Design an enzyme around this catalytic site. Sequence first.
Site, PDB file in Angstrom:
ATOM      1  N   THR A  37       7.681  -2.227 -16.512  1.00  0.00           N
ATOM      2  CA  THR A  37       8.055  -0.862 -16.166  1.00  0.00           C
ATOM      3  C   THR A  37       7.063  -0.316 -15.153  1.00  0.00           C
ATOM      4  OG1 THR A  37       6.855   0.112 -18.062  1.00  0.00           O
ATOM      5  CG2 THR A  37       9.069  -0.568 -18.435  1.00  0.00           C
ATOM      6  N   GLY A  38       7.575   0.333 -14.108  1.00  0.00           N
ATOM      7  CA  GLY A  38       6.675   0.874 -13.097  1.00  0.00           C
ATOM      8  C   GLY A  38       6.669   2.399 -13.193  1.00  0.00           C
ATOM      9  N   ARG A  42      13.211   0.382 -14.924  1.00  0.00           N
ATOM     10  CA  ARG A  42      12.920  -0.926 -15.502  1.00  0.00           C
ATOM     11  C   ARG A  42      13.184  -2.057 -14.489  1.00  0.00           C
ATOM     12  NH1 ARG A  42      12.163   0.073 -20.784  1.00  0.00           N
ATOM     13  NH2 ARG A  42      13.253  -1.180 -22.345  1.00  0.00           N
ATOM     14  N   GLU A 107      11.892 -10.027  -4.652  1.00  0.00           N
ATOM     15  CA  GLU A 107      11.405 -11.370  -4.927  1.00  0.00           C
ATOM     16  C   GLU A 107      10.826 -11.469  -6.330  1.00  0.00           C
ATOM     17  OE1 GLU A 107       9.069 -13.111  -1.931  1.00  0.00           O
ATOM     18  OE2 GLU A 107       7.818 -14.310  -3.285  1.00  0.00           O
ATOM     19  N   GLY A 112       2.728 -12.919 -12.759  1.00  0.00           N
ATOM     20  CA  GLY A 112       2.418 -11.732 -13.540  1.00  0.00           C
ATOM     21  C   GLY A 112       1.505 -10.745 -12.840  1.00  0.00           C
ATOM     22  N   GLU A 113       1.180  -9.645 -13.522  1.00  0.00           N
ATOM     23  CA  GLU A 113       0.350  -8.590 -12.976  1.00  0.00           C
ATOM     24  C   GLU A 113      -1.123  -8.971 -12.995  1.00  0.00           C
ATOM     25  OE1 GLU A 113       1.275  -5.199 -15.426  1.00  0.00           O
ATOM     26  OE2 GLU A 113       3.420  -5.361 -14.995  1.00  0.00           O
ATOM     27  N   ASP A 152      -0.118   4.566  -4.955  1.00  0.00           N
ATOM     28  CA  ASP A 152      -0.108   4.177  -6.371  1.00  0.00           C
ATOM     29  C   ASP A 152      -0.831   2.865  -6.612  1.00  0.00           C
ATOM     30  OD1 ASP A 152       0.378   4.721  -9.003  1.00  0.00           O
ATOM     31  OD2 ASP A 152       2.336   3.736  -9.000  1.00  0.00           O
ATOM     32  N   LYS A 154      -3.181   0.233  -8.239  1.00  0.00           N
ATOM     33  CA  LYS A 154      -3.700  -0.150  -9.537  1.00  0.00           C
ATOM     34  C   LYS A 154      -3.384  -1.625  -9.755  1.00  0.00           C
ATOM     35  CE  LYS A 154       0.239   2.024 -11.950  1.00  0.00           C
ATOM     36  NZ  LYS A 154       0.586   3.239 -12.742  1.00  0.00           N
ATOM     37  N   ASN A 157       0.190  -2.887 -10.528  1.00  0.00           N
ATOM     38  CA  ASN A 157       1.171  -2.937  -9.455  1.00  0.00           C
ATOM     39  C   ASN A 157       0.935  -4.113  -8.513  1.00  0.00           C
ATOM     40  OD1 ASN A 157       2.686  -0.740 -10.207  1.00  0.00           O
ATOM     41  ND2 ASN A 157       1.673   0.721  -8.838  1.00  0.00           N
ATOM     42  N   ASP A 170       6.229  -1.679  -6.396  1.00  0.00           N
ATOM     43  CA  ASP A 170       6.432  -0.287  -6.764  1.00  0.00           C
ATOM     44  C   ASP A 170       6.033   0.699  -5.670  1.00  0.00           C
ATOM     45  OD1 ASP A 170       6.266   1.414  -9.974  1.00  0.00           O
ATOM     46  OD2 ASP A 170       6.851   2.136  -7.989  1.00  0.00           O
ATOM     47  N   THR A 187      -1.917   7.628 -10.314  1.00  0.00           N
ATOM     48  CA  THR A 187      -2.388   7.324 -11.679  1.00  0.00           C
ATOM     49  C   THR A 187      -3.756   7.999 -11.818  1.00  0.00           C
ATOM     50  OG1 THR A 187      -1.082   5.310 -11.889  1.00  0.00           O
ATOM     51  CG2 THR A 187      -2.970   5.444 -13.314  1.00  0.00           C
TER      52      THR A 187
END
Lengths: 336, 18
Positions: A37-38, A42, A107, A112-113, A152, A154, A157, A170, A187
């Site tokens: 979730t950004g 979703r 894409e 992962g983050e 944004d 972080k 993201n 995002d 944020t």
Amino acid sequence: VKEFLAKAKEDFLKKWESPAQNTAHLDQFERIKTLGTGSFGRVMLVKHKETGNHYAMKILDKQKVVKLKQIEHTLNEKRILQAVNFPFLVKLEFSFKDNSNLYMVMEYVPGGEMFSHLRRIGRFSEPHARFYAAQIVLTFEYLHSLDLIYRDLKPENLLIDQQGYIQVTDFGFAKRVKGRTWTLCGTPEYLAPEIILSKGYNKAVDWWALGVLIYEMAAGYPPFFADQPIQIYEKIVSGKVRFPSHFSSDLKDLLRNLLQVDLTKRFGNLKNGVNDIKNHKWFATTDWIAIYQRKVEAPFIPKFKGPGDTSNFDDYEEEEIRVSINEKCGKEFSEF
Amino acid sequence: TTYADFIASGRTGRRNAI
């Protein structure tokens, strides 16, 4: 470098002037799993039938967008994303809308983050944080050269790709703007002082943000934190910051020029723009071209035992998708 | 330690935008 950028601009401009629209439909895709979730909506892992390609689909509920007063920011996000092109930006493959929802097919980035790895491992080594930080530098240089503010940044993201490189996702708060703007967004941990102080701001808030990010990667925690945003803002605005005793002196000098509450002398915002940052000692060993060309070897390459495997992402409550029989918010999102 | 304070704080998860 100029001809690079100058030409990047002409391409963005044509796309920006005449955006692509309706390049697909929900039927051409299979739903597999929610990836995260950004800002809003979703993002689900999906499979594109006709090609068997895997993608990440961001879905936004039109009515909810209207409720949160996010219409313009949403239109911004797609219009800008369909127009940019950069190795460290997640690519938008298609977009479309139905009676209920807005869709943005991006894409799939399987590693992962950054967020997940950073927390798990604690903190990154300075050379490790430098490799990431460089890609953000180049990315903000690309984006700012097109009059875009990211707003944004972080680790949540920043996705890690199969080659161990970063892709920024995002664009919910991204905005093309000349001169200053005023929206209170971002944020709490990453907000520049000018933002919290409703002073009006510009692209320099992004360079502050890079400050917060370099710190968080190197320390394992943000420069300003606390149980509530309110306490967090008191510390951002107070003109003071502490460094872990393991921080190299160069890194500390960089961070002092980035988390510079004085827009006057904030690195990235001076006479020499990004070059002030690109030239700092902390970046002494950074090969800016090789990084743009991904010729540089990454610190870390994610486990990936599938073209469409999701274990580098946390699991999320899987929410059904509801498509009205009635069109919602037609006029609002007509340009989507 | 500052890390210990962070780890026990309420903001070590994924942080929402305002």
